[PDB]
Amino acid sequence: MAHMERFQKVYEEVQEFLLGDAEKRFEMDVHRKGYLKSMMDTTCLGGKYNRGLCVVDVAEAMAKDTQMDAAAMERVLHDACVCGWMIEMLQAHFLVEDDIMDHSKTRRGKPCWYLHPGVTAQVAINDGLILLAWATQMALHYFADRPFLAEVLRVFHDVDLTTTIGQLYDVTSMVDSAKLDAKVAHANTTDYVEYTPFNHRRIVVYKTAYYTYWLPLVMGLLVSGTLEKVDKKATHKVAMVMGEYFQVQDDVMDCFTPPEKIGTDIEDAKCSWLAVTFLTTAPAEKVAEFKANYGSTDPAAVAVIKQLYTEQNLLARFEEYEKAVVAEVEQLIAALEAQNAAFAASVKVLWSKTYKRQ
Amino acid sequence: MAHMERFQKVYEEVQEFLLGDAEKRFEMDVHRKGYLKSMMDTTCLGGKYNRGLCVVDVAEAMAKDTQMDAAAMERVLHDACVCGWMIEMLQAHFLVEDDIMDHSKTRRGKPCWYLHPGVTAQVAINDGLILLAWATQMALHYFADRPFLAEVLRVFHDVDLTTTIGQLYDVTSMVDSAKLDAKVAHANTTDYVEYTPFNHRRIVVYKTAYYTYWLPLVMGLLVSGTLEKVDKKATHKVAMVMGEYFQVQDDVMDCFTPPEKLGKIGTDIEDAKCSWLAVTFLTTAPAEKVAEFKANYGSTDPAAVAVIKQLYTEQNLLARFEEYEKAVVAEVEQLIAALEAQNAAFAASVKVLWSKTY
Numbered sequence A: 001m002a003h004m005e006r007f008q009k010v011y012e013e014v015q016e017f018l019l020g021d022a023e024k025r026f027e028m029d030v031h032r033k034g035y036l037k038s039m040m041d042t043t044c045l046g047g048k049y050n051r052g053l054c055v056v057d058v059a060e061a062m063a064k065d066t067q068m069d070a071a072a073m074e075r076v077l078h079d080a081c082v083c084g085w086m087i088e089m090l091q092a093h094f095l096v097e098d099d100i101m102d103h104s105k106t107r108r109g110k111p112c113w114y115l116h117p118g119v120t121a122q123v124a125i126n127d128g129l130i131l132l133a134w135a136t137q138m139a140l141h142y143f144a145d146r147p148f149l150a151e152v153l154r155v156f157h158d159v160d161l162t163t164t165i166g167q168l169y170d171v172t173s174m175v176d177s178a179k180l181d182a183k184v185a186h187a188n189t190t191d192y193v194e195y196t197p198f199n200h201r202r203i204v205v206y207k208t209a210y211y212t213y214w215l216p217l218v219m220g221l222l223v224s225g226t227l228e229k230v231d232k233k234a235t236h237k238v239a240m241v242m243g244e245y246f247q248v249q250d251d252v253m254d255c256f257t258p259p260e261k262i263g264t265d266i267e268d269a270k271c272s273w274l275a276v277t278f279l280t281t282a283p284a285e286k287v288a289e290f291k292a293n294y295g296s297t298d299p300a301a302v303a304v305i306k307q308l309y310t311e312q313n314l315l316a317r318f319e320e321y322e323k324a325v326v327a328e329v330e331q332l333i334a335a336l337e338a339q340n341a342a343f344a345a346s347v348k349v350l351w352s353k354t355y356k357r358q
Numbered sequence B: 001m002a003h004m005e006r007f008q009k010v011y012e013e014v015q016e017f018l019l020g021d022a023e024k025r026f027e028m029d030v031h032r033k034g035y036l037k038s039m040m041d042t043t044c045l046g047g048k049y050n051r052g053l054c055v056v057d058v059a060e061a062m063a064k065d066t067q068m069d070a071a072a073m074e075r076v077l078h079d080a081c082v083c084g085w086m087i088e089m090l091q092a093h094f095l096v097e098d099d100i101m102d103h104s105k106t107r108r109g110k111p112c113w114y115l116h117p118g119v120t121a122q123v124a125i126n127d128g129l130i131l132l133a134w135a136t137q138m139a140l141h142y143f144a145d146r147p148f149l150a151e152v153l154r155v156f157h158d159v160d161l162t163t164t165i166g167q168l169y170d171v172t173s174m175v176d177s178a179k180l181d182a183k184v185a186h187a188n189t190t191d192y193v194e195y196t197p198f199n200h201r202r203i204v205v206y207k208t209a210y211y212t213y214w215l216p217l218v219m220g221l222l223v224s225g226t227l228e229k230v231d232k233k234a235t236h237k238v239a240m241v242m243g244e245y246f247q248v249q250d251d252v253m254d255c256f257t258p259p260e261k262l263g264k265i266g267t268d269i270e271d272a273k274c275s276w277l278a279v280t281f282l283t284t285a286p287a288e289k290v291a292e293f294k295a296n297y298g299s300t301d302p303a304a305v306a307v308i309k310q311l312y313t314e315q316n317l318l319a320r321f322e323e324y325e326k327a328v329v330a331e332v333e334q335l336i337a338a339l340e341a342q343n344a345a346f347a348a349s350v351k352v353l354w355s356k357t358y
């Protein structure tokens, strides 16, 4: 951990600023102030803060790689926690909104924010918008005298964009893209036309890889003032490789591990690494059976799909994929190390947090 | 006339940049690109563009006052247009979300975006995020090297927060605020505990006045380099006053002025709106008038409606509004005079905007 202490304290610090700023600016009352506090805690807390804490570990390793008096170092660590929370708030913004779009039931053991008894979708959609707003507010306030403010905004807002596009690709893949037309319905169920391993790749990259991997790394570099020290290209590729792997692994785990949440990809008819890899490689009659049973809440259907995946050896094949990814990541790190050991060491520890999640 | 044609041309130019940039950055396919084109056209076009044109009116007024050359003037007019489109997209983004939040049916005599057959709420929620994302993109690209970029992003994102908090106030007027709690379900009907003048003023001011009156003014001073030529808080204050007044006037005409003098029914009583009329009445009326109000408000029977309008007359609410209107006329003219003493051209921009609000 190490930076968990520091990170949770900045949250409390940031919460108080954010609520206080609303009282100052928008005549905020005690009742709704209290509502926004429960809103923040419920949507932003619970996770393991891997993405936020990445900003911190990156920043630390870069500032430790220069000669910095404790004072500058402490400012770099605080600034890294604020970027960290910007990303956690960005994510939380996308979970809130995405749970409403998908009519999802639960989120980390609990009902989705919009299904909290005294919230409702009507309030929750705007709640989502407040969290995004707040992310920019942190930067505007905490980085007001920092040379990296313009860059943080640019890169954070490009990733907001990137992720909305990944979102677009993920909710417009139910039907052959050629039939997509605002003023004509195709409705209900998928035809699997877009369900190609490449299109899945396109989805995960924009929807997940940038905000989960690329954004923490760069904010890391931006707050520590070390962006010009590393190759843009290599930073992008390694973010993409890890980002791809992480989702491929989350997809496999949804279906394959006990794990003690309840995995719901099959019944939701998710465009998953499992689904796309199966559809493009399995024998003809298997494909027929898959299509007959996919995207059903019925537990018999779900069990058939899982049995089809097992017969296709998809678990062992993932581990093959995993091993091919190990090779790539290790190659990309070794290449980064030749340019800056501090950053590469950092990337080596973010890999160890992604690799073989259990 | 005058700048409408220039505004439309710029729209096309930004649409082309935005869609192309998506093709460049995210591998945007032809079909999803055509979808986003119709999403943009449907949500952003067909309105009055009054907020967007206002920026251009203001920017031109200030630019002529500086006596700058032809090449520079064109840049200022083009910058104004882009900014104007930031506001329209921001508005557009909030309509898309609000129509989903409130399960609205129509928008400018057309089905709401999410109600278009090949668009559901599941996609349309995210469409709205894209629109808000596009607003920042425009500034990031067109103003990449303009000195006013930081202030445009700050002012823009500050108004985005203000508007989400105005939305919050609007969606939390259902029950008594002492009862508002995420954990506890409340009725989907109104108890009128939040129907107060204070509350009505927060809703209109933070939900509407910042983006409708404040932002256009400040964007225009920003793109023409003239912000330091006006008093910031006289400008803000005049914006808050007009903005509140526009909505009070709207509520009154919705009830009192005939269907002929503004092509539309007039449905505020029947929809149970937190109107200026409702909140002024409940906060001042005798107890049994109040009890009669509650017994007849929010239902669609012409009998009950006529009763409410009788009650409004019997409380002399027109004279009350007339006294209110008189007070704002005085106040706005005072602030315009103050602005004239430092800058005459900006005062005339505010004048013309004001005369548009009567």
Ligand SMILES: O=P(O)(O)C(O)(C[n+]1cccc(F)c1)P(=O)(O)O
Binding pocket: A094, A095, A098, A163, A167, A207, A208
């Ligand atoms: O597994 P989840 O529920 O975290 C999910 O990734 C949501 N989600 C997470 C992050 C960003 C996003 F836009 C959307 P998905 O929709 O089920 O794939």
Ligand SMILES: O=P(O)(O)C(O)(C[n+]1cccc(F)c1)P(=O)(O)O
Binding pocket: B094, B095, B098, B102, B167, B170, B207, B208
């Ligand atoms: O009078 P309407 O219905 O156009 C409204 O102002 C829409 N609207 C306009 C601006 C922002 C907002 F989110 C929502 P309302 O708030 O639904 O009454």
Ligand SMILES: [Mg+2]
Binding pocket: A098, A102
């Ligand atoms: Mg989803």
Ligand SMILES: [Mg+2]
Binding pocket: A250, A251, A254
């Ligand atoms: Mg998952």
Ligand SMILES: [Mg+2]
Binding pocket: B098, B102, B170
């Ligand atoms: Mg509304």
Ligand SMILES: [Mg+2]
Binding pocket: B250, B251, B254
């Ligand atoms: Mg109205």
Ligand code: NA
Binding pocket: A132, A133, A134, A136, B157, B158, B160, B161
């Ligand atoms: Na914002």
Ligand code: NA
Binding pocket: A140
């Ligand atoms: Na501020």
Ligand code: NA
Binding pocket: A156, A157, A158, A160, A161, B132, B133, B134, B136
């Ligand atoms: Na954005």
Ligand code: NA
Binding pocket: B140
């Ligand atoms: Na760019």
